[PDB]
Amino acid sequence: MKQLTILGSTGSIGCSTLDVVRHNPEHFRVVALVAGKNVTRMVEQCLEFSPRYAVMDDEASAKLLKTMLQQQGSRTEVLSGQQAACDMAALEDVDQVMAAIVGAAGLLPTLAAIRAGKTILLANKESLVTCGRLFMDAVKQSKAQLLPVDSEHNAIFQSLPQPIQHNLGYADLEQNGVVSILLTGSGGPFRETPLRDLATMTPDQACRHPNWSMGRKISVDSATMMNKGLEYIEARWLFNASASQMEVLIHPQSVIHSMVRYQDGSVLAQLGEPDMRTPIAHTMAWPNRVNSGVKPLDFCKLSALTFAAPDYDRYPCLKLAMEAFEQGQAATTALNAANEITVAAFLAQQIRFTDIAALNLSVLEKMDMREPQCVDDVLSVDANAREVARKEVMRLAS
Amino acid sequence: MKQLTILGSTGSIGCSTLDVVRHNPEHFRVVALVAGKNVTRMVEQCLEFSPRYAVMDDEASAKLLKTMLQQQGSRTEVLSGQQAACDMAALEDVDQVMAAIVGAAGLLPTLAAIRAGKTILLANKESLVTCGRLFMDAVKQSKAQLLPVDSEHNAIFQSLPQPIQHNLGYADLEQNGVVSILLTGSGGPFRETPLRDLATMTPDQACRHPNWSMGRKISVDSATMMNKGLEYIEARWLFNASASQMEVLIHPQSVIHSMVRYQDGSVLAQLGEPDMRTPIAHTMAWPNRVNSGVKPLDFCKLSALTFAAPDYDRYPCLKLAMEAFEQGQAATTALNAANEITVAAFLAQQIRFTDIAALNLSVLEKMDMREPQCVDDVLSVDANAREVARKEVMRLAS
Ligand SMILES: O=CN(O)CCCP(=O)(O)O
Ligand SMILES: O=CN(O)CCCP(=O)(O)O
């Protein structure tokens, strides 16, 4: 049996993970849950799965949680704060850590799992994006295996040969017959919205994906295709791909999740319901398989599958991300940080949908700092870009 | 370097194989070519690749070939007949045998390659279909590895886990996380032809596939979906799949070549240009890859990808094949044999398109023989069904 620390347990991916545990009680045990402020969701999960430990980011949420747990008589112990999360990620009995915190705040707990040599179920793209080569070196240095949970990188992983799967980020694509990695592709809810209407789209419209049901941050990123931008950066580290070994396609139907192009002309792809339980279950059971709760994809009830090149006038954030990778790690760390601040500002009705790409661009220009040489440098660049992004947001606020 | 005997070299798959050798002269050498009666094509191939040996099925064709080769001064030696083909398949220096003869006539040379422990690039579905468990036992008994060349089984193979790839036909699908195998799917050139017009379709119309450019036999089988019927039978042996582990879909665009359904909801698929060089190159280079001459699939210039359940009123041959597998090996051997005779009769303008399924059904009913216990029994059943099918054809001739 394999035992779990879930980072970001109350989130969309966290809840999907627990649903896989739920369907496979004889294969998977949760030792620790880590979350932020959603106390009701966390109390549901603690009462259901009886984890050894539960961590909340702030102490007030931890107290509310503990009060309810000791009333019901739960054996689950409650802690709070970032260091507690890092300790939960490194517990001896833990085999796998689901890294599903949103944003760069997930970085330190994820790195702690990595240093403890844990199998990392990686669903926190912002951490690899913001940390890059330093993240990949921490993985190589330790006994840890990365297993991509994000739907796209998971599909790529499944469609890659074993020498790459077993040496992720360090193996040579070309020697293993890989020509390129095909990153798809939904296009968001406004793929067919007139360009000139984009600025009037509300947070609720942006968070309503036709196919996916995920968190608000990721839904907005899908709308701007910053999600694909972040995944483009991440895929380059995870799979050791150059710019010429990356293609980005829009696939509106979200059936194909991504693909790998080989030298003989073959393209290998993963398909399925747009449901995170599938890629999560893939990583948790790898190299075997388990039921994930997701039913068989019915090919006779599908929409016709299409593809299209991304239009950078529609999706300026994609351009920003792809070019940030070329500009280096400081620009990338700062882009991620800015986008966290501007997406939050959009969701809090402080700026418009199209202001995200505008202010992200502005922050990048105003950033003037050196390439990070360590994790502390990554965090200084992050914190600084957050400060500049907050100032820029105030630039377009009522 | 790997060295080749090609069985059926002058055919569509044979020519596609030689094109892969052509693009990879430093990886692949042809020791022997085996063909039938197409002397011009065979002389082209002998003069180009300078094989050690060339075999033609009849002695008159061998003579015409030899006359031209010794005029030009070629070192290639010419032989004729079936036993010669079997010897070519077992030469010491041969590493791989492309089994690309059409029909059950390919059986004996393919079995000779198998007994010699050769890597079998298997593109002769009629042989496995007609020989079944006996074929798979010959493979298991010897040192031979099957590598499926047919576009569909190749796609399945690429989309299967390594434990299955390395123990093909004997490994358990369910233990390796496989729920089912999804066999696709073109539907032929008459997929959208009114049912009532099918009977007026000519051989030239039947042989014009929108996507594939292959031999006449396989093109007619694609039109009736007997191709899928034969591939259904073959896939059950190759992948150790039961009836409940097989799904058959129409995919009109021939981009997806087939798929594998896993327990967590994942579906793995191979995609590409509908071009046999790709699956051929996959098998020849396995577990590595080579350029096959096929260019990268352009997803931005594709038709929208669709799927549909097969309609047995449109494709009665599919029903015949799927039910023949249940009826056992004699019925299957006899169905294949009948279909070879009736497809030939259709191409020779002796019967109509729709007469293929009718006479195939008739032959099956008239067959009354025991399940084959050995290869000789397989050939008696085959020869007998050919005789009955010829008689039935005469039933509807002018
Ligand atoms: O893990 C799943 N995702 O990343 C969501 C994909 C939505 P997009 O294709 O619009 O980025
Ligand atoms: O190897 C390639 N084929 O089998 C040709 C497929 C044509 P179909 O899908 O109509 O059977």
UniProtKB/Swiss-Prot annotation, chains A, B:
Inhibited by fosmidomycin. Mn(2+) binds at residues 150, 152, 231. Its EC number is 1.1.1.267. GO terms for cellular component: Dxr protein complex. It catalyses: 2-C-methyl-D-erythritol 4-phosphate + NADP(+) = 1-deoxy-D-xylulose 5-phosphate + NADPH + H(+). Pfam families: DXP_redisom_C, DXP_reductoisom, DXPR_C. GO terms for biological process: isopentenyl diphosphate biosynthetic process, methylerythritol 4-phosphate pathway; isopentenyl diphosphate biosynthetic process, methylerythritol 4-phosphate pathway involved in terpenoid biosynthetic process. Divalent cation. Prefers Mg(2+), Mn(2+) or Co(2+). Keywords: Cobalt, Isoprene biosynthesis, Magnesium, Manganese, Metal-binding, NADP, Oxidoreductase. GO terms for molecular function: 1-deoxy-D-xylulose-5-phosphate reductoisomerase activity; identical protein binding; manganese ion binding; NADPH binding. 1-deoxy-D-xylulose 5-phosphate binds at residues 125, 151-152, 186, 209, 222, 227-228, 231. Catalyzes the NADPH-dependent rearrangement and reduction of 1-deoxy-D-xylulose-5-phosphate (DXP) to 2-C-methyl-D-erythritol 4-phosphate (MEP). Homodimer. Belongs to the DXR family. This is 1-deoxy-D-xylulose 5-phosphate reductoisomerase. The gene is dxr.
